[PDB]
Design an enzyme around this catalytic site. Structure first.
Site, short mmCIF file in Angstrom:
data_model
loop_
_atom_site.label_atom_id
_atom_site.label_comp_id
_atom_site.label_asym_id
_atom_site.label_seq_id
_atom_site.Cartn_x
_atom_site.Cartn_y
_atom_site.Cartn_z
N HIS A 112 -16.16 -42.27 13.61
CA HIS A 112 -16.79 -41.11 12.97
C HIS A 112 -17.73 -40.44 13.97
O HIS A 112 -17.73 -39.20 14.11
CB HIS A 112 -17.60 -41.56 11.75
CG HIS A 112 -18.42 -40.48 11.11
ND1 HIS A 112 -18.11 -39.88 9.91
CD2 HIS A 112 -19.61 -39.94 11.48
CE1 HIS A 112 -19.10 -39.03 9.58
NE2 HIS A 112 -20.04 -39.03 10.51
N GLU A 113 -18.57 -41.24 14.61
CA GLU A 113 -19.51 -40.75 15.59
C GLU A 113 -18.83 -40.04 16.77
O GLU A 113 -19.28 -38.99 17.20
CB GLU A 113 -20.40 -41.89 16.09
CG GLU A 113 -21.41 -42.37 15.05
CD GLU A 113 -22.14 -41.21 14.37
OE1 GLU A 113 -22.86 -40.47 15.06
OE2 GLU A 113 -21.98 -41.02 13.14
N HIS A 116 -17.89 -36.54 16.06
CA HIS A 116 -18.97 -35.59 16.35
C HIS A 116 -19.05 -35.30 17.86
O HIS A 116 -19.34 -34.18 18.28
CB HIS A 116 -20.33 -36.14 15.87
CG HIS A 116 -20.48 -36.24 14.38
ND1 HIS A 116 -20.44 -35.16 13.52
CD2 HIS A 116 -20.81 -37.31 13.60
CE1 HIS A 116 -20.77 -35.59 12.28
NE2 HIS A 116 -21.00 -36.89 12.27
N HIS A 122 -18.57 -32.56 9.84
CA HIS A 122 -18.40 -33.48 8.72
C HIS A 122 -17.30 -32.86 7.84
O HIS A 122 -17.31 -31.64 7.60
CB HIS A 122 -19.66 -33.55 7.86
CG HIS A 122 -20.60 -34.66 8.24
ND1 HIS A 122 -21.96 -34.63 8.01
CD2 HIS A 122 -20.35 -35.84 8.85
CE1 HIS A 122 -22.48 -35.76 8.48
NE2 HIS A 122 -21.54 -36.54 8.99
#
Ligand SMILES: O=C(CC1(S(=O)(=O)c2ccc(Oc3ccc(Cl)cc3)cc2)CCOCC1)NO
Ligand SMILES: O=C(CC1(S(=O)(=O)c2ccc(Oc3ccc(Cl)cc3)cc2)CCOCC1)NO
Ligand SMILES: [Ca+2]
Ligand SMILES: [Ca+2]
Ligand SMILES: [Zn+2]
Ligand SMILES: [Zn+2]
Ligand SMILES: [Zn+2]
Ligand SMILES: [Zn+2]
Lengths: 159, 160
Positions: A112-113, A116, A122
């Site tokens: 997920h990180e 980014h 998101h």
């Protein structure tokens, strides 16, 4: 806005006391594999020096004025593609990082990180990795949700 | 582009400068926000406490960030562009004489320029822009926000 370079480089600056070095190296490598498998992005691990994405574990105030809340709550934060701070991902070492389910699965959070890091916003799709709510299925295999494959590829392309 | 993904932004005046009365400060801040809301769909609501989108503060030397205040002169103030936490927050050096007149630094003029930063405005090379890096005093309730700053803010939030 995204990476001009398809070939990125990351450096695991430090470690969590919760997992072995291999456990952490596997988590991140598997985490980058998530994205590289569905794009032209390449990720080379750097032992020393500056790396496009500096991976670090820290608690509370760790050098950026986005302090970690400690145990639970905020788990990790990453900066978008760009110079210096950009691409960088920090992990709240006040969280119990794990390879399995006991606390917070590192591989899952790192994926997920890195989303980014690669420029992924998101998601609004409840079943997307870039969806800002932690969920862990327990399954021993990870499928990148189509939402994610689309979003990332809308930035760097497929294959 | 770095900007606020919402037109409705809140602001809290955390502490206060000794140079002006609470009302002088507040008033000067009101005007400074109006400069921008008047040319975009941006709405600015004041908060007396809690987490606002734009936390205003008057601090000297090290005041809680990577941009310490140099005391009298030099850096008069700085603000952060849109973003969480401190993003959008504005800091004024309380070692500078803040005023609503021309003697010393006019809080309104510096605040307006500073608020542009919070909104997502960079510095201009146009010597007439409010976002021009150097400080210039003018003062007049019938204040004209330079065309450049209009073009820049509207590129961010569109026109009024
Ligand atoms: O996205 C965030 C911020 C949070 S978080 O730290 O809690 C967070 C970070 C990573 C996450 O990773 C995952 C998300 C979804 C899935 Cl399926 C797996 C891991 C989840 C939450 C905290 C604030 O609210 C939104 C989420 N950090 O990058
Ligand atoms: O721009 C700055 C920093 C400085 S400053 O603190 O001196 C400053 C702050 C606000 C200003 O506000 C104004 C700018 C233009 C005009 Cl016409 C009026 C006020 C000007 C300078 C200091 C370093 O050099 C650039 C300017 N902060 O946003
Ligand atoms: Ca936490
Ligand atoms: Ca100063
Ligand atoms: Zn951080
Ligand atoms: Zn996230
Ligand atoms: Zn400051
Ligand atoms: Zn400025």
């Amino acid at each position: 806005l995204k990476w001009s370079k398809m070939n990125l480089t990351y450096r695991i600056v430090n470690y969590t006391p919760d997992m072995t070095h291999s456990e952490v190296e596997k988590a991140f490598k598997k985490a980058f594999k998530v994205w590289s498998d569905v794009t032209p992005l390449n990720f080379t691990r750097l032992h020393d020096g500056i790396a496009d994405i500096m991976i670090s574990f820290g608690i509370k105030e760790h050098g950026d004025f986005y302090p970690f809340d400690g145990p639970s709550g905020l788990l990790a934060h990453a900066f978008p593609p760009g110079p210096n701070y950009g691409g960088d991902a920090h992990f709240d070492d006040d969280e119990t990082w794990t390879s399995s389910s006991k606390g917070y699965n590192l591989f899952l959070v790192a994926a997920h990180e890195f989303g980014h890091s690669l420029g992924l916003d998101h998601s609004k799709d409840p079943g997307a990795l870039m969806f800002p709510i932690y969920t862990y299925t327990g399954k021993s295999h990870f499928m990148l949700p189509d939402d994610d494959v689309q979003g990332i590829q809308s930035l760097y392309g497929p294959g």
